[PDB]
């Protein structure tokens, strides 16, 4: 179900794909949600959720890997993490 909600956000809302973009969006306070793939290294994972703790941002743990996280977003590449800047027509922020 969250895959359908996440797909709608990519179609209508705003997002950043990739570790470097996600950290920038947490620094600027522009992140509404951080989604982390299951096979992300724990050190990178435990650092992203430390940034979210400082930034007061909820974190959603995707159940698939970065191959499955990429294809949910309609991409032909791998996405290890992403941040939702603007949930648009979707209601992913109210569900997480």
């Amino acid at each position: 179900n969250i895959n359908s909600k996440l797909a709608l956000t990519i179609k209508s809302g705003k997002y950043t794909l990739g570790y470097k973009s996600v950290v920038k969006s947490l620094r600027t306070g522009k992140a509404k949600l951080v989604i982390i793939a299951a096979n992300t290294p724990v050190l990178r994972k435990s650092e992203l959720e430390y940034y979210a703790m400082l930034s007061k941002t909820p974190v959603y743990y995707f159940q698939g890997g970065n191959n499955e996280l990429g294809t949910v977003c309609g991409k032909l590449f791998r996405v290890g993490t992403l941040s939702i800047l603007d949930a648009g027509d979707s209601d992913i922020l109210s569900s997480i």
Binding site: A37, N39, P41, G65, N66, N67, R78
Partner: protein, 91 residues
């Protein structure tokens, strides 16, 4: 074009050793020279070193595997068996 009808990788052996031995070699030798998906980084960059050793070029993770495949069927069964027995002991 298609170069060989059926020998494939065992075409390096010519006519020697017997057809049955060459087709038995072909099955396991395609597997040992294949590229596998890394369970750590997600890329298809895992190749065999020596037997039982499978390295990923990208993330430099080495995992112990089978002689000619990254995972044998027996190891996959043990992984679930160990996982199941662990749940009961830890409730």
């Amino acid at each position: 074009t298609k170069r060989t009808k059926k020998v494939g990788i065992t075409g390096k052996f010519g006519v020697r050793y017997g057809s049955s031995l060459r087709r038995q070699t072909k099955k396991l030798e395609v597997q040992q020279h294949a590229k596998y998906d890394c369970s750590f980084c997600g890329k298809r960059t895992v190749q065999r070193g020596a037997t039982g050793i499978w390295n990923c070029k990208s993330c430099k993770k080495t995992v112990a595997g089978g002689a000619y495949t990254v995972s044998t069927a027996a190891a996959a069964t043990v992984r679930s068996t160990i996982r199941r027995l662990r749940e009961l002991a830890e409730a």
